[PDB]
Amino acid sequence: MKLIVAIVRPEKLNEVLKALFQAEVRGLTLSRVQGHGGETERVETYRGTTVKMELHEKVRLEIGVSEPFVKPTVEAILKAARTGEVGDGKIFVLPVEKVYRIRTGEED
Amino acid sequence: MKLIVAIVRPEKLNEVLKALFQAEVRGLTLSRVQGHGGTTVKMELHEKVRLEIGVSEPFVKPTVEAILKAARTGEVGDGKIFVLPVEKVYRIRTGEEDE
Amino acid sequence: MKLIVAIVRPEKLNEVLKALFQAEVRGLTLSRVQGHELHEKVRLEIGVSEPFVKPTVEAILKAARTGEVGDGKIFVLPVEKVYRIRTGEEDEAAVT
Numbered sequence: 603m604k605l606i607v608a609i610v611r612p613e614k615l616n617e618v619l620k621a622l623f624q625a626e627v628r629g630l631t632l633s634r635v636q637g638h639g640g641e642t643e644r645v646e647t648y649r650g651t652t653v654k655m656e657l658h659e660k661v662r663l664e665i666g667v668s669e670p671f672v673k674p675t676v677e678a679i680l681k682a683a684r685t686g687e688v689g690d691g692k693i694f695v696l697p698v699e700k701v702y703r704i705r706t707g708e709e710d
Numbered sequence: 711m712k713l714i715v716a717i718v719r720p721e722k723l724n725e726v727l728k729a730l731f732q733a734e735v736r737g738l739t740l741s742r743v744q745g746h747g748g749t750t751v752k753m754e755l756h757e758k759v760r761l762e763i764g765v766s767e768p769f770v771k772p773t774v775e776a777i778l779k780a781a782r783t784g785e786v787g788d789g790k791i792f793v794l795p796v797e798k799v800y801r802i803r804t805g806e807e808d809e
Numbered sequence: 810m811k812l813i814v815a816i817v818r819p820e821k822l823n824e825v826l827k828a829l830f831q832a833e834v835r836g837l838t839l840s841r842v843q844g845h846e847l848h849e850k851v852r853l854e855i856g857v858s859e860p861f862v863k864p865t866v867e868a869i870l871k872a873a874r875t876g877e878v879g880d881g882k883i884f885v886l887p888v889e890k891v892y893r894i895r896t897g898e899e900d901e902a903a904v905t
Contacts, residue, residue, distance in 0.1 A: 604889060605715075605792055605794065607812075607854075608894075609838055609894075610894065619746065619747075622747070623747070627747075628747035629745075629747050630745075630746060630747060631717055631743040631744060631745055631746070631758060631760070632743065632744055632746060632755075633741070633742065633743040633744060633760075633840065634840070635838040635839060635840040635854075636838060636839050636840065637836070637837070637838040637839075638835075638836060638837055638838075639836065653830060655826060655830060657839070660838060662838065662840070664743070666790065666792060672889075676890075676892060679894070680892060680894055680897050683894045684894055684895065684897070685895070686895060687895065688895065689895075690893075690894035690895035691894040691895075692836060692856065692891065692892065692893055692894060692903065693890075693891065693892040693894060694812055694856055694888050694890075694891055694892075695888065695889035695890045695891075696794065696812060696886060696887065696888055696889060697794065697795050697886075697887050697889060698792055698793070698794055699712065699792075699793040699794060699795055700792075700793045701790060701791070701792050701793075702774065702778060702790060702791045702793075703788075703790050704716075704717075704718065704777070704778055704781045704782050704788040704789040704790055704791060705782060705783075705784060705785070705786065705788035705789075707778050707782050713814075713884055713886065736845065737844075737845075737882065738844075738845045739816055739842050739843065739844050739845065739850065739852070740842065740843055740845070741840065741841070741842040741843065741852070762842075764882060764884055794886065795886065795887050796884050796885065796886055797811070797885045797886065797887060798884075798885045799882060799883065799884045799885070800866060800870065800882065800883045801880075801882055802815075802817070802869070802870060802873045802874055802880035802881045802882060802883060803874065803875075803876065803877070803878060803879070803880040803881075805870060805874075
């Protein structure tokens with residue numbers, strides 16, 4: 603299956619989890635990180651020009667999803683997360699060799 | 711190579727760490743993430759320690775087994791392990807590739 | 810499109826963010842982690858397209874090496890797809 607990793611605004615988090623519950627995607631982890639979207643060129647007297655790179659509070663979700671659920675998950679997220687402004691986040695779909703459920707001690 | 715992402719109970723982090731070392735495993739990196747989705751406790755998020763071992767093909771099963779052994783408790787919320795492909799892993803200090 | 814996950818020293822964070830800025834990276838996330846007896850480290854995650862992978866690993870290696878143990882590691886992973894949330898556009902359209 604696949605491992606999805608999405609960076610979403612913090613204020614947009616519940617809107618995302620609500621969307622994910624509706625999509626039937628129960629079971630994921632999250633944590634805050636710091637992300638980057640845009641900059642601003644700054645010219646000055648001392649050492650003139652300097653490029654300001656801004657980092658923002660963001661939430662990284664890491665859902666593991668079966669193939670039939672990649673499109674639903676991504677869609678649910680793009681929609682639940684979109685704002686239209688700079689810094690809305692990003693989604694990555696990654697290859698997952700195996701996924702063991704520590705409990706049972708098996709896969710699935 | 712492979713990158714093993716282990717999501718375990720903070721309570722079992724120590725055993726998993728002991729099991730992974732008696733199994734010759736370093737380079738490991740970890741952090742805190744939270745799970746979602748006579749008395750009772752109940753929260754929306756559950757504390758988990760997220761391990762992250764980059765490993766060689768030989769020790770992929772040793773790592774995964776050491777972890778599955780040190781983390782299983784039979785209770786829901788035990789966590790999971792993702793074995794993920796890795797195309798090329800470099801060591802910043804010396805600049806290597808298969809280690 | 811690849812996913813580059815790099816673990817670097819706190820003290821060498823800015824030097825890399827600088828090097829990545831020059832590598833033409835325009836999107837990346839970072840968080841604090843502990844390497845391993847635990848040590849303080851910064852975990853960076855940049856999604857980059859093929860043309861820039863080789864160049865980005867180099868910019869990091871140069872920028873994060875001090876010689877001592879614990880400089881960190883750089884992993885390169887396969888990415889199925891990348892979506893810029895703001896626009897919904899895939900991969901390259903979701904980079905730079």
